[PDB]
From a paper:
The botulinum neurotoxins (BoNT) are potent bacterial toxins produced mainly by toxigenic Clostridium botulinum species. The holotoxins are expressed as single-chain proteins that need to be proteolytically activated into a functional di-chain form, which consists of a ~50 kDa light chain (LC) linked by a single disulphide bond to the ~100 kDa heavy chain (HC). Although they all share a common modular architecture based on the three functional domains necessary for their activity, namely the binding (HC) and translocation domains (HN), which form HC and the catalytic (LC) domain, they present distinctive properties. Serotypes A, B and E are the main BoNT associated with human botulism. These neurotoxins specifically target presynaptic motoneurons via a dual-receptor binding mechanism, which involves membrane-anchored gangliosides and a protein receptor.
Complete movies were collected on a Titan Krios microscope, resulting in EM maps at 3.6 and 3.7Å average resolution for BoNT/B and BoNT/E, respectively, although local resolution varied significantly. Here, BoNT/B also presents a linear arrangement of its three domains, whereas the BoNT/E map shows it retained its more compact domain organisation, thus alleviating reservation that this singular domain organisation among BoNTs may have been experimental artefacts. Our structures are of inactive variants of the toxins presenting dual mutations at the catalytic site (BoNT/B1 E231Q/H234Y and BoNT/E1 E213Q/H216Y). A similar set of mutations (i.e., HQxxY) in BoNT/A was previously shown to prevent binding of the catalytic Zn2+ ion, which is also not visible in either of the two maps presented here. In the cryo-EM map of BoNT/B, the belt is well-ordered except for a small surface-exposed α-helix (residues 487–495), whereas in BoNT/E, a section could not be modelled due to the lack of map for residues 499–515, which forms a random coil in the crystal structure. For BoNT/B, the lack of density in some areas, particularly the HCC subdomain, suggests that the preferred particle orientation observed in the angular distribution map is the main reason affecting map quality and resolution, although local dynamism of the domain cannot be excluded. Since HC/B has been well defined by X-ray crystallography, it was fully included in the deposited coordinates associated with the map. Although the crystal structures of BoNT/B and BoNT/E were used to produce the cryo-EM models some differences were observed when comparing the output from both methods, with direct superposition showing root mean square deviations of 1.9 Å (over 1218 paired residues) and 2.0 Å (over 1197 paired residues) for types B and E, respectively. For example, overall superposition with BoNT/B results in a nearly perfect overlap of the translocation domains, whilst the core secondary structure of LC appears shifted by approximately 1.5 Å, with some of the larger loops deviating more significantly.
Residue numbers in the entry: 1 to 1291
The structure:
Amino acid sequence: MPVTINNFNYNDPIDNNNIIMMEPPFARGTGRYYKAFKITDRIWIIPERYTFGYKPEDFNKSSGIFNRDVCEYYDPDYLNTNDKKNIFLQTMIKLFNRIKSKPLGEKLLEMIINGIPYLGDRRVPLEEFNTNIASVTVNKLISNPGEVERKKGIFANLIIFGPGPVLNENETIDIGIQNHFASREGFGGIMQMKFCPEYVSVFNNVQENKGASIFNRRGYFSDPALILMHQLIYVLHGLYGIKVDDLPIVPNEKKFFMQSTDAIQAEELYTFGGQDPSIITPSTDKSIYDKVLQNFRGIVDRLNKVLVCISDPNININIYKNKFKDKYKFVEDSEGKYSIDVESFDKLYKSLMFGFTETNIAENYKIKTRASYFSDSLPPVKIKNLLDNEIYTIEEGFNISDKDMEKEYRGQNKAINKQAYEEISKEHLAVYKIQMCKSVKAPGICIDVDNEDLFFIADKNSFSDDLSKNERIEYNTQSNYIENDFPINELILDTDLISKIELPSENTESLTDFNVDVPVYEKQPAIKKIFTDENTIFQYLYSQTFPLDIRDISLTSSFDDALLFSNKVYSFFSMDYIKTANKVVEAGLFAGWVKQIVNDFVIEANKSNTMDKIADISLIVPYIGLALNVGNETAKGNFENAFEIAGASILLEFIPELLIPVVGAFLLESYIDNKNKIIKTIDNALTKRNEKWSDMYGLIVAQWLSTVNTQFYTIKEGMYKALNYQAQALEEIIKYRYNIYSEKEKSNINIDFNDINSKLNEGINQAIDNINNFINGCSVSYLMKKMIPLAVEKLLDFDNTLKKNLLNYIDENKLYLIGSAEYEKSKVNKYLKTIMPFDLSIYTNDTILIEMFNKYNSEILNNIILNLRYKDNNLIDLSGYGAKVEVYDGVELNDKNQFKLTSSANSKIRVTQNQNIIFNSVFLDFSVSFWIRIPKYKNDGIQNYIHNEYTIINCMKNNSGWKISIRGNRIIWTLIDINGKTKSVFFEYNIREDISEYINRWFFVTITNNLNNAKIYINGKLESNTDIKDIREVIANGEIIFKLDGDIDRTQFIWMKYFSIFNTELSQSNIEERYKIQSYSEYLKDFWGNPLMYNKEYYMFNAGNKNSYIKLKKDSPVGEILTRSKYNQNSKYINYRDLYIGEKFIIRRKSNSQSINDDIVRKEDYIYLDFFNLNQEWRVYTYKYFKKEEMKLFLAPIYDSDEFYNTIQIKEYDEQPTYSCQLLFKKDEESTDEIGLIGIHRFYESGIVFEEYKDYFCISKWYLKEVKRKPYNLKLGCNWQFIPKDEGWTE
């Protein structure tokens, strides 16, 4: 039969059957009875204020509190009269009907009703049903008081009292005697409950978006009749007796900003559900499991031993034995002897522990609840009337589809309903506050902070170290890993407990001994003063807030001034924003000023890709340090620089000390002489090692989740608060500016505040989205980088020791006992090689962590191993792992990451790596990318060109590795194989073809090998490929040393720019992006790729013609174009074109010619390109009003016209990187429109000597298409390459 609610009023006469006057167990024998109603059998409601342990004066509000976590509300005038008691009882009936509606409520019930507590705790022999114990029975009055008093015994399972002296507090107390509890040792007892239906908690969410664009009423409130099932699941645990006590999670209190909280056991963590039960280590899980199993076996022994009761003759035997067997799910043998089935007990334990939880109940009932135990909270709000059927419907609840609210959880939104659910005045709320004040005796600055805002950091005393126990293993031992996931189909298969037997009656004899212990509660002070000077969130969020009674303010960027003056506020935005906000305008431009300041606020709050630079950083929020200052004072300096040089470890202000004990070795002393069972022991040892790997990973994950995410969530909450405060301050300032003036401007220009409020809220929402994404990525990066390697090191050492021990054992015993051994030698040599990969999907289930972990792992810029970059005249790895580099300050290098390597031993770079990261078993898969410049041959050393072999990059550690060699016109990549053979990759440049653009030029090279193929990229394309299909099984273990390692001529020096080695697959669509990112630059390029320089000798080169230059004759000053020649010296071995030809285009200025001062780079600079010929000065001239066609520029004598603007402009006209420039001679400065397009014209120049047929490159309207469609300009007369002279190139 389904559970049935009995409906009746409060003034009904005492029937002594359904409305009795019992005595609560904690009342002992005082003699003050209480009326009590029953809803369902063994579920007694008793409406009255809980007064067992509290003083009568305790109820009124005082300066004290009870517990240091929750915020409390006092009220003495609750449940005063019969009307209030009747309303309480009606609300209880309504809530129970709401619970009974859904099938899951019926499953939760019918389980705390049919579960009868065992008769008698351990202080009784194994053959007695000692009914006279305070944890079983209570006494009820039969006769009307005054002449005759009788007491009869009545059973119970749950007694629901009223609220305590604090309405918010709800608890489920149990019964225990002489400091020993029968509710934990598999027995169970009657339990009480405290409750109040009206008041409910108010929570909030961050990731999601609120329905309304307002923060006056924000968040949600918890639905009544769902707080109740939390207490009922606690009651079910206590009643079934599995409320085992074990290691708590103590909050650390060794610092001045730590949270103070009472210890919390696993009972409060196993029922809240979600990701919280994952901070409970599997060792503690198995310990609890074993304790529960042992207790149940003990009760099996007691139940099989008991045979007669000597207290109440009315009690039967066989029916009670059958009922207890049904309750505990035992197995009855044909001889009447009970037992325990391991699978049945495991199923029961999982169903009772993981099967029911608050998150699952909320998801089933479609009710909004919090995300985790460690989360935000808000002051509570009451409900005006829970009985009015227009507000709360027992079929749906707060989400009535009639009023169009069953969507997006609209029913429980505080802002949208806003009318039927009053708030609670803060004139009676008492909270635990901490007063943080400066070291000075009287600073005038003493800040208050709630205890609910500080950082919660766990302590290392709360994590067990069962890994270090010496383990004995034999062929009969298999260890089962207990899961932490509940399939909801268990209850479906159970199907409403059809097989349960009807419970026996509740009429037994009365009790005699009623001695039982009762708790005593005491108040605490609510003020705690500490002296601190380390500025943090608690010191910035207060300075960002202005007093309520002030009217006019003015933002400023001085935190010291913000603390000193209450008039000003602190703003971490830009100085232009501060100036705009401080500006004062007139009535004419008020609307324009308002729009401008709102747009500026939105743009300033929306920033995600600041300082787009070649560096490998995806996203960053550049005002977190300026707004919060969390860590080692990240506010000062550059947050971007600090992040890029310190990794993700700079935000946190307390680095946890990990607990990674060394795991104990195995004791495989089974000593089986025959029956070849040693293989079973070996396999069991391997499985046990796997389980220990899993346990260590779980421990690391639990500690991470307990500390790091908590601190980062506090950071995110502070960010939300700061942004909201800034928006509110801006709106208040705008309102004051509007209100300052008289009615004239109000009538002339009209504006409403709702539009600007909505715009500001939208901006805040977008900014919070970006900040949340950044913080989540940072947290996952820290987890994957700074914690796992230590664990994998410890497990690798343990694996080595275990392999040695197993090898010694097998050699000493089994090698002689059994001939066949090579199979298990191969097993112990191969299986113990590969490590178990990490995977968060096994140790966590909720999508919030998994999705961002997957995104981080899919990201390609988070897989750097050996990020080599220049930073402060030193080489520091930017990968974040931390590698030791040995260099001195004597050497001098350019800032833009330039390395020069030669045969001299003076230049020495030593790198020691932390190659203990999760290893790559397959290997044969990586990439190496770098930028090279190589010298040129000087027609000397044919042996050097042909025979010589040299290299600068190598990895030779265990006589098998890989290296990259460079020859004269060759690129080689050699890898070694354990067998003896070697595979090599060859590439070369054509030099007899007379076409070359790589020689003495920067060139990007990438080598990428996978299991299938090894590929070479030099320009983003494939030219030469060869197969590496052979399985090499050679892994790079040692260091890589950068040196030629050969004493040769000093004339050779190799230039290197950017070394990056990836252990990740780089197949395609990433190499080209890397090329573009690392080659993109604002400045201009030389012939080879160096920055364009001033006062540098230059010569003409264009891709249109291979032989053209400008030369001025030594005898006579005439400049013109002649054809180029080859090298004058004859050399049949090799030949090349001539380069050091023509006249220089030096930028010589008489005012500043030597020691030019550092200037400021500006786009489209005004540069004059004129050269000097000894004492003759030339002038570049063009006839302003030219009427001819194809007219050359004039090299004229000196003219006294310099104030006129005949400047030359330089730019680019192609998207992809190149080595060329675009020159322009703009005669009119304000020519905002295009004067003309490109024109290549065949021209018969009117030369006196001869009519030269040239291809002149002028501004003509005959080739509009090229520079109108704007492709990548590679071939044109608009190249104008500037080729300097340097000692690297020998004439």
